mmCIF file of C-alpha atoms and ligand atoms in Angstrom:
data_model
loop_
_atom_site.group_PDB
_atom_site.id
_atom_site.type_symbol
_atom_site.label_atom_id
_atom_site.label_comp_id
_atom_site.label_asym_id
_atom_site.label_seq_id
_atom_site.Cartn_x
_atom_site.Cartn_y
_atom_site.Cartn_z
ATOM 1 C CA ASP A 1 169.706 38.127 43.018
ATOM 2 C CA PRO A 2 168.002 36.977 46.271
ATOM 3 C CA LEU A 3 165.581 34.036 46.466
ATOM 4 C CA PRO A 4 161.856 34.852 46.996
ATOM 5 C CA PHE A 5 161.045 34.955 50.706
ATOM 6 C CA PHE A 6 158.861 32.470 52.440
ATOM 7 C CA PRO A 7 155.924 33.633 54.515
ATOM 8 C CA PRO A 8 156.760 35.031 57.997
ATOM 9 C CA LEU A 9 156.153 32.902 61.114
ATOM 10 C CA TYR A 10 152.868 34.548 61.978
ATOM 11 C CA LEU A 11 151.521 33.594 58.537
ATOM 12 C CA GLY A 12 152.388 29.927 59.049
ATOM 13 C CA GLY A 13 155.781 30.088 57.315
ATOM 14 C CA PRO A 14 158.567 27.609 58.060
ATOM 15 C CA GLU A 15 161.004 27.851 60.898
ATOM 16 C CA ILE A 16 164.314 29.311 59.802
ATOM 17 C CA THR A 17 167.386 27.031 59.877
ATOM 18 C CA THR A 18 170.833 27.119 58.405
ATOM 19 C CA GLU A 19 169.359 25.257 55.384
ATOM 20 C CA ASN A 20 166.804 27.893 54.375
ATOM 21 C CA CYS A 21 167.928 31.126 55.955
ATOM 22 C CA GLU A 22 168.430 32.929 52.592
ATOM 23 C CA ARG A 23 164.521 32.860 52.492
ATOM 24 C CA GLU A 24 163.800 34.442 55.864
ATOM 25 C CA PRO A 25 161.505 37.463 55.254
ATOM 26 C CA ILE A 26 163.621 39.733 57.454
ATOM 27 C CA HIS A 27 161.849 42.933 56.258
ATOM 28 C CA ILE A 28 158.451 41.846 57.633
ATOM 29 C CA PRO A 29 158.901 40.538 61.143
ATOM 30 C CA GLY A 30 155.712 42.144 62.493
ATOM 31 C CA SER A 31 157.604 43.286 65.536
ATOM 32 C CA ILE A 32 160.110 45.791 66.893
ATOM 33 C CA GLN A 33 162.952 46.138 69.294
ATOM 34 C CA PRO A 34 161.743 47.122 72.811
ATOM 35 C CA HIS A 35 163.792 50.358 73.345
ATOM 36 C CA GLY A 36 161.234 52.299 71.232
ATOM 37 C CA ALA A 37 157.659 52.289 70.048
ATOM 38 C CA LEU A 38 156.207 52.147 66.531
ATOM 39 C CA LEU A 39 152.929 53.203 65.006
ATOM 40 C CA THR A 40 151.727 53.031 61.434
ATOM 41 C CA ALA A 41 149.251 55.467 59.936
ATOM 42 C CA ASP A 42 147.298 56.050 56.754
ATOM 43 C CA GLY A 43 149.350 58.411 54.540
ATOM 44 C CA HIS A 44 146.374 60.507 53.621
ATOM 45 C CA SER A 45 144.084 60.610 56.675
ATOM 46 C CA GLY A 46 146.706 60.038 59.309
ATOM 47 C CA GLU A 47 144.532 57.416 60.981
ATOM 48 C CA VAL A 48 146.637 55.224 63.305
ATOM 49 C CA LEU A 49 146.400 51.686 61.960
ATOM 50 C CA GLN A 50 148.954 49.550 63.865
ATOM 51 C CA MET A 51 150.764 50.014 67.154
ATOM 52 C CA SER A 52 153.516 48.119 68.874
ATOM 53 C CA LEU A 53 152.196 46.430 72.075
ATOM 54 C CA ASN A 54 154.532 48.502 74.306
ATOM 55 C CA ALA A 55 153.153 51.785 72.978
ATOM 56 C CA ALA A 56 151.825 52.872 76.471
ATOM 57 C CA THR A 57 155.302 52.894 77.975
ATOM 58 C CA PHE A 58 156.517 55.534 75.551
ATOM 59 C CA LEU A 59 153.471 57.429 74.618
ATOM 60 C CA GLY A 60 151.628 57.487 77.980
ATOM 61 C CA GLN A 61 148.458 55.884 76.582
ATOM 62 C CA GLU A 62 147.096 52.479 75.680
ATOM 63 C CA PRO A 63 147.229 50.944 72.118
ATOM 64 C CA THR A 64 143.551 50.124 72.410
ATOM 65 C CA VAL A 65 142.851 53.900 72.984
ATOM 66 C CA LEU A 66 145.188 55.436 70.360
ATOM 67 C CA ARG A 67 144.380 53.105 67.394
ATOM 68 C CA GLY A 68 141.941 54.842 64.963
ATOM 69 C CA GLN A 69 142.819 58.329 66.138
ATOM 70 C CA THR A 70 144.344 60.580 63.521
ATOM 71 C CA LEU A 71 147.761 62.137 63.652
ATOM 72 C CA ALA A 72 145.977 65.418 62.912
ATOM 73 C CA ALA A 73 144.505 65.159 66.409
ATOM 74 C CA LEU A 74 147.413 63.390 68.167
ATOM 75 C CA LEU A 75 150.268 65.448 66.705
ATOM 76 C CA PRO A 76 148.746 68.796 65.657
ATOM 77 C CA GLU A 77 152.066 70.695 65.622
ATOM 78 C CA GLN A 78 153.850 67.986 63.532
ATOM 79 C CA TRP A 79 151.229 66.466 61.240
ATOM 80 C CA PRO A 80 151.317 69.177 58.614
ATOM 81 C CA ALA A 81 155.161 69.191 58.499
ATOM 82 C CA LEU A 82 155.278 65.394 58.345
ATOM 83 C CA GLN A 83 152.825 65.345 55.424
ATOM 84 C CA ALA A 84 154.804 67.958 53.560
ATOM 85 C CA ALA A 85 158.044 66.134 54.151
ATOM 86 C CA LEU A 86 156.847 62.688 52.942
ATOM 87 C CA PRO A 87 154.586 63.141 49.944
ATOM 88 C CA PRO A 88 153.001 60.184 48.175
ATOM 89 C CA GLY A 89 155.574 58.359 46.073
ATOM 90 C CA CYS A 90 158.669 59.835 47.869
ATOM 91 C CA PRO A 91 161.627 57.452 48.379
ATOM 92 C CA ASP A 92 161.023 55.018 51.301
ATOM 93 C CA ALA A 93 164.426 55.962 52.680
ATOM 94 C CA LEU A 94 163.402 59.653 53.016
ATOM 95 C CA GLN A 95 162.782 60.602 56.669
ATOM 96 C CA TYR A 96 161.019 63.198 58.713
ATOM 97 C CA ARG A 97 162.445 63.798 62.168
ATOM 98 C CA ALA A 98 161.175 65.769 65.132
ATOM 99 C CA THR A 99 161.823 65.966 68.853
ATOM 100 C CA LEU A 100 158.752 65.831 71.171
ATOM 101 C CA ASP A 101 158.380 66.305 74.952
ATOM 102 C CA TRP A 102 156.932 63.599 77.171
ATOM 103 C CA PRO A 103 156.210 63.020 80.896
ATOM 104 C CA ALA A 104 159.674 61.439 81.499
ATOM 105 C CA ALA A 105 163.284 62.846 81.423
ATOM 106 C CA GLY A 106 164.818 63.917 78.138
ATOM 107 C CA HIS A 107 162.508 63.916 75.097
ATOM 108 C CA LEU A 108 161.001 61.525 72.494
ATOM 109 C CA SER A 109 162.654 61.453 69.078
ATOM 110 C CA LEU A 110 160.146 60.880 66.297
ATOM 111 C CA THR A 111 161.321 59.395 62.931
ATOM 112 C CA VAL A 112 158.887 58.849 60.082
ATOM 113 C CA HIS A 113 159.109 57.354 56.636
ATOM 114 C CA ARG A 114 156.632 56.385 53.935
ATOM 115 C CA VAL A 115 156.109 53.017 52.292
ATOM 116 C CA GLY A 116 153.329 53.002 49.675
ATOM 117 C CA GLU A 117 150.258 54.657 51.349
ATOM 118 C CA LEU A 118 151.530 53.995 54.897
ATOM 119 C CA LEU A 119 153.487 56.257 57.288
ATOM 120 C CA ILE A 120 155.730 54.407 59.787
ATOM 121 C CA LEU A 121 156.457 56.338 62.966
ATOM 122 C CA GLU A 122 159.196 55.458 65.365
ATOM 123 C CA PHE A 123 159.421 56.918 68.924
ATOM 124 C CA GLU A 124 162.481 56.582 71.020
ATOM 125 C CA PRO A 125 163.647 58.317 74.186
ATOM 126 C CA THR A 126 166.572 60.669 73.812
ATOM 127 C CA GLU A 127 168.359 62.801 76.390
ATOM 128 C CA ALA A 128 168.855 66.567 75.707
ATOM 129 C CA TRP A 129 172.714 66.345 75.795
ATOM 130 C CA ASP A 130 172.341 63.440 73.272
ATOM 131 C CA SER A 131 172.290 66.103 70.494
ATOM 132 C CA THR A 132 175.190 65.881 68.076
ATOM 133 C CA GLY A 133 175.933 68.930 65.944
ATOM 134 C CA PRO A 134 176.817 69.067 62.253
ATOM 135 C CA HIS A 135 180.405 69.626 63.544
ATOM 136 C CA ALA A 136 180.949 65.993 64.245
ATOM 137 C CA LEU A 137 180.589 65.149 60.564
ATOM 138 C CA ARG A 138 182.239 68.325 59.380
ATOM 139 C CA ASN A 139 185.427 67.972 61.473
ATOM 140 C CA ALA A 140 185.667 64.250 60.537
ATOM 141 C CA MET A 141 185.733 64.897 56.786
ATOM 142 C CA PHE A 142 189.236 66.416 57.186
ATOM 143 C CA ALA A 143 191.073 63.202 58.091
ATOM 144 C CA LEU A 144 189.007 61.207 55.571
ATOM 145 C CA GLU A 145 190.088 63.619 52.819
ATOM 146 C CA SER A 146 193.808 63.455 53.603
ATOM 147 C CA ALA A 147 194.002 59.635 53.515
ATOM 148 C CA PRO A 148 196.525 58.821 50.721
ATOM 149 C CA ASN A 149 194.965 55.540 49.540
ATOM 150 C CA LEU A 150 192.067 53.145 49.967
ATOM 151 C CA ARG A 151 193.425 51.170 52.883
ATOM 152 C CA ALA A 152 194.442 54.395 54.734
ATOM 153 C CA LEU A 153 190.930 55.732 54.087
ATOM 154 C CA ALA A 154 189.448 52.546 55.564
ATOM 155 C CA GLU A 155 191.670 52.852 58.665
ATOM 156 C CA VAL A 156 190.828 56.461 59.317
ATOM 157 C CA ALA A 157 187.105 55.768 58.721
ATOM 158 C CA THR A 158 186.957 53.028 61.394
ATOM 159 C CA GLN A 159 188.952 55.118 63.870
ATOM 160 C CA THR A 160 186.739 58.154 63.250
ATOM 161 C CA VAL A 161 183.523 56.123 63.725
ATOM 162 C CA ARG A 162 184.872 54.605 66.937
ATOM 163 C CA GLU A 163 185.737 58.075 68.247
ATOM 164 C CA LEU A 164 182.258 59.349 67.419
ATOM 165 C CA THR A 165 180.368 56.420 68.872
ATOM 166 C CA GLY A 166 182.535 54.891 71.605
ATOM 167 C CA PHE A 167 181.765 51.417 70.199
ATOM 168 C CA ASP A 168 184.062 48.624 71.396
ATOM 169 C CA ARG A 169 184.687 47.522 67.817
ATOM 170 C CA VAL A 170 184.334 49.233 64.448
ATOM 171 C CA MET A 171 185.204 47.339 61.262
ATOM 172 C CA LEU A 172 185.142 48.085 57.554
ATOM 173 C CA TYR A 173 183.834 44.847 56.035
ATOM 174 C CA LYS A 174 184.406 44.708 52.269
ATOM 175 C CA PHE A 175 182.503 42.320 49.959
ATOM 176 C CA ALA A 176 184.200 40.334 47.190
ATOM 177 C CA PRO A 177 182.428 39.532 43.920
ATOM 178 C CA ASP A 178 181.503 36.103 45.306
ATOM 179 C CA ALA A 179 179.788 37.932 48.252
ATOM 180 C CA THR A 180 182.362 36.659 50.782
ATOM 181 C CA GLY A 181 183.779 39.455 52.951
ATOM 182 C CA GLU A 182 186.949 40.629 54.581
ATOM 183 C CA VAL A 183 187.612 42.923 57.505
ATOM 184 C CA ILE A 184 189.909 45.429 55.893
ATOM 185 C CA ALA A 185 190.166 47.910 58.767
ATOM 186 C CA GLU A 186 189.374 47.772 62.430
ATOM 187 C CA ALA A 187 189.362 50.080 65.406
ATOM 188 C CA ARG A 188 188.895 48.292 68.718
ATOM 189 C CA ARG A 189 189.157 48.464 72.481
ATOM 190 C CA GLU A 190 192.607 47.417 73.731
ATOM 191 C CA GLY A 191 192.539 43.712 74.558
ATOM 192 C CA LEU A 192 189.757 42.644 72.183
ATOM 193 C CA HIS A 193 190.639 39.883 69.717
ATOM 194 C CA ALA A 194 191.376 41.315 66.253
ATOM 195 C CA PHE A 195 189.172 40.386 63.287
ATOM 196 C CA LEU A 196 191.401 42.436 60.977
ATOM 197 C CA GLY A 197 192.272 40.499 57.786
ATOM 198 C CA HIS A 198 189.766 37.707 58.589
ATOM 199 C CA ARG A 199 187.434 36.519 55.803
ATOM 200 C CA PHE A 200 183.866 35.269 56.167
ATOM 201 C CA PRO A 201 181.534 33.240 54.067
ATOM 202 C CA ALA A 202 178.794 34.797 51.955
ATOM 203 C CA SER A 203 176.146 33.092 54.078
ATOM 204 C CA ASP A 204 176.999 35.250 57.054
ATOM 205 C CA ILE A 205 175.155 38.182 55.377
ATOM 206 C CA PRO A 206 172.622 36.378 53.169
ATOM 207 C CA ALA A 207 171.461 37.721 49.788
ATOM 208 C CA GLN A 208 168.096 39.200 50.947
ATOM 209 C CA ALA A 209 169.966 41.046 53.722
ATOM 210 C CA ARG A 210 172.515 42.425 51.224
ATOM 211 C CA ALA A 211 169.620 43.489 48.932
ATOM 212 C CA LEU A 212 167.858 45.207 51.811
ATOM 213 C CA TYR A 213 171.097 46.945 52.802
ATOM 214 C CA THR A 214 171.424 48.375 49.347
ATOM 215 C CA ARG A 215 168.190 50.442 49.895
ATOM 216 C CA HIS A 216 168.100 51.038 53.662
ATOM 217 C CA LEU A 217 171.560 51.997 54.754
ATOM 218 C CA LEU A 218 171.451 51.666 58.531
ATOM 219 C CA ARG A 219 170.321 48.857 60.838
ATOM 220 C CA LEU A 220 171.043 47.767 64.371
ATOM 221 C CA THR A 221 170.397 45.465 67.284
ATOM 222 C CA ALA A 222 170.391 47.550 70.528
ATOM 223 C CA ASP A 223 170.299 44.514 72.849
ATOM 224 C CA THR A 224 171.114 41.074 71.468
ATOM 225 C CA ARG A 225 169.115 39.399 74.275
ATOM 226 C CA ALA A 226 165.954 41.547 74.075
ATOM 227 C CA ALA A 227 162.687 39.976 72.955
ATOM 228 C CA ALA A 228 160.829 41.597 70.113
ATOM 229 C CA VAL A 229 157.518 43.432 70.649
ATOM 230 C CA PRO A 230 154.659 42.599 68.225
ATOM 231 C CA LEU A 231 152.748 45.117 66.058
ATOM 232 C CA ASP A 232 149.017 44.938 66.570
ATOM 233 C CA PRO A 233 147.341 44.206 64.342
ATOM 234 C CA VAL A 234 150.282 42.448 62.696
ATOM 235 C CA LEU A 235 149.002 43.003 59.127
ATOM 236 C CA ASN A 236 148.508 46.421 57.494
ATOM 237 C CA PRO A 237 144.714 46.875 57.141
ATOM 238 C CA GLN A 238 145.287 48.867 53.951
ATOM 239 C CA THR A 239 146.569 45.775 52.227
ATOM 240 C CA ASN A 240 145.732 42.842 54.544
ATOM 241 C CA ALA A 241 149.409 42.113 54.124
ATOM 242 C CA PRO A 242 152.594 42.353 56.157
ATOM 243 C CA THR A 243 154.029 45.795 56.923
ATOM 244 C CA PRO A 244 157.461 46.504 55.310
ATOM 245 C CA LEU A 245 159.752 47.570 58.148
ATOM 246 C CA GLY A 246 163.101 47.660 56.327
ATOM 247 C CA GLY A 247 163.088 51.424 56.642
ATOM 248 C CA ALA A 248 162.589 51.389 60.439
ATOM 249 C CA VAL A 249 165.693 51.055 62.643
ATOM 250 C CA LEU A 250 163.310 49.647 65.295
ATOM 251 C CA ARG A 251 162.566 46.660 63.086
ATOM 252 C CA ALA A 252 163.108 43.341 64.891
ATOM 253 C CA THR A 253 166.434 41.710 63.925
ATOM 254 C CA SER A 254 166.463 38.211 62.415
ATOM 255 C CA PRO A 255 166.641 35.701 65.306
ATOM 256 C CA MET A 256 169.292 33.848 63.300
ATOM 257 C CA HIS A 257 171.494 36.959 63.283
ATOM 258 C CA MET A 258 170.725 37.655 66.997
ATOM 259 C CA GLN A 259 172.121 34.175 67.797
ATOM 260 C CA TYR A 260 175.162 34.864 65.624
ATOM 261 C CA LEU A 261 175.824 38.047 67.595
ATOM 262 C CA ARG A 262 175.435 36.366 70.960
ATOM 263 C CA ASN A 263 177.855 33.604 69.794
ATOM 264 C CA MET A 264 180.491 36.361 69.166
ATOM 265 C CA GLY A 265 179.860 37.852 72.650
ATOM 266 C CA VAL A 266 178.251 40.987 71.151
ATOM 267 C CA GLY A 267 175.763 42.925 73.271
ATOM 268 C CA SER A 268 174.822 45.618 70.705
ATOM 269 C CA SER A 269 175.440 45.746 66.915
ATOM 270 C CA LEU A 270 175.025 48.480 64.265
ATOM 271 C CA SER A 271 176.107 48.729 60.611
ATOM 272 C CA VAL A 272 176.025 51.268 57.837
ATOM 273 C CA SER A 273 176.089 50.388 54.133
ATOM 274 C CA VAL A 274 178.845 51.660 51.800
ATOM 275 C CA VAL A 275 177.052 51.637 48.413
ATOM 276 C CA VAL A 276 179.158 52.447 45.401
ATOM 277 C CA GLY A 277 177.559 53.209 42.039
ATOM 278 C CA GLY A 278 174.440 51.490 43.380
ATOM 279 C CA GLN A 279 176.143 48.194 44.473
ATOM 280 C CA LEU A 280 176.848 47.208 48.063
ATOM 281 C CA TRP A 281 180.617 47.657 48.496
ATOM 282 C CA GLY A 282 180.867 46.952 52.178
ATOM 283 C CA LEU A 283 179.641 47.775 55.668
ATOM 284 C CA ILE A 284 180.864 49.864 58.556
ATOM 285 C CA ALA A 285 180.167 47.150 61.170
ATOM 286 C CA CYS A 286 180.102 48.062 64.865
ATOM 287 C CA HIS A 287 179.865 45.967 68.080
ATOM 288 C CA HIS A 288 179.556 46.778 71.747
ATOM 289 C CA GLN A 289 180.098 44.370 74.545
ATOM 290 C CA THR A 290 176.857 45.402 76.291
ATOM 291 C CA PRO A 291 173.441 46.678 75.189
ATOM 292 C CA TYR A 292 173.574 50.255 73.918
ATOM 293 C CA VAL A 293 171.194 52.631 72.083
ATOM 294 C CA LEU A 294 173.196 54.940 69.801
ATOM 295 C CA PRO A 295 171.258 58.231 69.789
ATOM 296 C CA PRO A 296 169.214 59.127 66.680
ATOM 297 C CA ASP A 297 171.318 62.164 65.721
ATOM 298 C CA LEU A 298 174.479 60.129 65.917
ATOM 299 C CA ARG A 299 172.924 57.372 63.800
ATOM 300 C CA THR A 300 172.081 59.989 61.170
ATOM 301 C CA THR A 301 175.676 61.309 61.358
ATOM 302 C CA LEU A 302 176.942 57.804 60.787
ATOM 303 C CA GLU A 303 174.656 57.345 57.689
ATOM 304 C CA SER A 304 175.996 60.566 56.314
ATOM 305 C CA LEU A 305 179.550 59.384 56.931
ATOM 306 C CA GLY A 306 178.792 56.108 55.076
ATOM 307 C CA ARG A 307 177.616 58.148 52.052
ATOM 308 C CA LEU A 308 180.783 60.344 52.267
ATOM 309 C CA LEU A 309 182.929 57.259 52.566
ATOM 310 C CA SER A 310 181.125 55.729 49.561
ATOM 311 C CA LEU A 311 182.126 58.708 47.432
ATOM 312 C CA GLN A 312 185.724 58.753 48.710
ATOM 313 C CA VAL A 313 186.020 55.072 47.963
ATOM 314 C CA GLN A 314 184.527 55.636 44.459
ATOM 315 C CA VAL A 315 187.022 58.473 43.796
ATOM 316 C CA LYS A 316 189.990 56.336 44.856
ATOM 317 C CA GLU A 317 188.963 53.210 43.026
ATOM 318 C CA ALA A 318 188.958 55.344 39.877
ATOM 319 C CA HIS A 319 192.860 55.677 39.886
HETATM 320 C C1 LBV B 1 171.416 31.063 57.899
HETATM 321 C C2 LBV B 1 171.498 32.565 58.286
HETATM 322 C C3 LBV B 1 172.581 33.168 58.782
HETATM 323 C C4 LBV B 1 172.792 34.628 59.257
HETATM 324 C C5 LBV B 1 171.912 35.546 58.649
HETATM 325 C C6 LBV B 1 171.880 36.995 58.813
HETATM 326 N N1 LBV B 1 172.906 37.803 58.961
HETATM 327 C C7 LBV B 1 172.441 39.052 58.966
HETATM 328 C C8 LBV B 1 173.128 40.368 59.123
HETATM 329 C C9 LBV B 1 174.545 40.507 59.425
HETATM 330 N N2 LBV B 1 175.517 39.618 59.470
HETATM 331 C C10 LBV B 1 176.654 40.252 59.726
HETATM 332 C C11 LBV B 1 177.891 39.506 59.750
HETATM 333 C C12 LBV B 1 179.061 39.877 60.508
HETATM 334 N N3 LBV B 1 179.142 40.637 61.601
HETATM 335 C C13 LBV B 1 180.449 40.558 61.970
HETATM 336 O O1 LBV B 1 180.950 41.096 62.984
HETATM 337 C C14 LBV B 1 181.289 39.734 61.094
HETATM 338 C C15 LBV B 1 182.716 39.402 61.170
HETATM 339 C C16 LBV B 1 183.466 39.815 62.186
HETATM 340 C C17 LBV B 1 180.350 39.248 60.094
HETATM 341 C C18 LBV B 1 180.702 38.357 58.972
HETATM 342 C C19 LBV B 1 176.451 41.659 59.813
HETATM 343 C C20 LBV B 1 177.464 42.724 59.998
HETATM 344 C C21 LBV B 1 175.104 41.835 59.609
HETATM 345 C C22 LBV B 1 174.389 43.155 59.549
HETATM 346 C C23 LBV B 1 173.608 43.636 60.727
HETATM 347 C C24 LBV B 1 174.574 44.102 61.798
HETATM 348 O O2 LBV B 1 175.373 45.016 61.536
HETATM 349 O O3 LBV B 1 174.429 43.593 63.007
HETATM 350 C C25 LBV B 1 170.986 39.029 58.796
HETATM 351 C C26 LBV B 1 170.091 40.220 58.767
HETATM 352 C C27 LBV B 1 169.767 40.737 60.170
HETATM 353 C C28 LBV B 1 168.695 41.783 60.057
HETATM 354 O O4 LBV B 1 169.015 42.916 59.485
HETATM 355 O O5 LBV B 1 167.576 41.584 60.535
HETATM 356 C C29 LBV B 1 170.629 37.697 58.656
HETATM 357 C C30 LBV B 1 169.269 37.101 58.481
HETATM 358 N N4 LBV B 1 174.172 34.737 59.397
HETATM 359 C C31 LBV B 1 174.724 33.544 59.437
HETATM 360 O O6 LBV B 1 175.817 33.352 59.886
HETATM 361 C C32 LBV B 1 173.835 32.447 59.008
HETATM 362 C C33 LBV B 1 173.723 31.477 60.170
#
């Protein structure tokens, strides 16, 4: 049961320290990571309500010009499909995805979800060869299925994720009932220090983070030195309140966790929740030595793999 959050910084809330970090409102940072752009829109009208300040870089026009325009006008070939895909009251983890063309090389990937009456739209560049087929997941299921026991399953799962991603380090991090954790499997680049078998305090993944990760199963930091980009306006006009960004991979990472990653020499981080019978069982935790943007289709493959692994774990634990 997490503590109530304090207000975010931009609402005059306290600075976050090691004494109060379980109260950081990590779901409402009012900012995004700079490798993409984000807009929010009214769920009925499609009016664009908030835009990240870097929106021009990705969309080819200025935030001051795009705000107030409707998605019906801006995205005529996707707006109807988006609407149909994310009806009022759908789960906030449900996503609509489309690939758009843009002046630059490759394409823009569009990912949308719905929170309350708001649509949250993420745009990130993707290269054409950065497609991953359903084969990646399909062929991977084979070695997961043949694993004879839980620890073998964990070992194959980390190796498979490393093969799919090329990450320098992939761990299966399992939580204990006291919320401490243990690295129970690890696939890593030759020469990297092993974390295998190491245990970590509960505070390293605080309670509000673990709660969030129970609902929104994938998060990342593409560049652990990159400054966040504000949303403008920072509050949702629908509510005059902060915008929930837990469902957006572009959400700005807690600065506290960014420092933790830099202290470990990590350039890029990504993890996927393993949720068993609705409780957070563990994470597939990935590091890269340098900044790296795992493509959207591969992220989705990894989420799917976490769900598959959840079930395989749940099968084996019953035995
Ligand atoms: C006082 C606050 C603290 C801080 C908070 C914090 N931690 C996270 C998220 C993560 N922490 C992780 C921990 C590990 N990564 C590892 O490699 C290992 C061991 C080898 C551990 C124990 C992980 C995996 C995450 C998840 C995100 C990720 O995969 O990179 C958050 C939430 C970040 C966010 O989603 O915005 C917060 C606020 N950790 C502390 O140590 C204290 C200082």
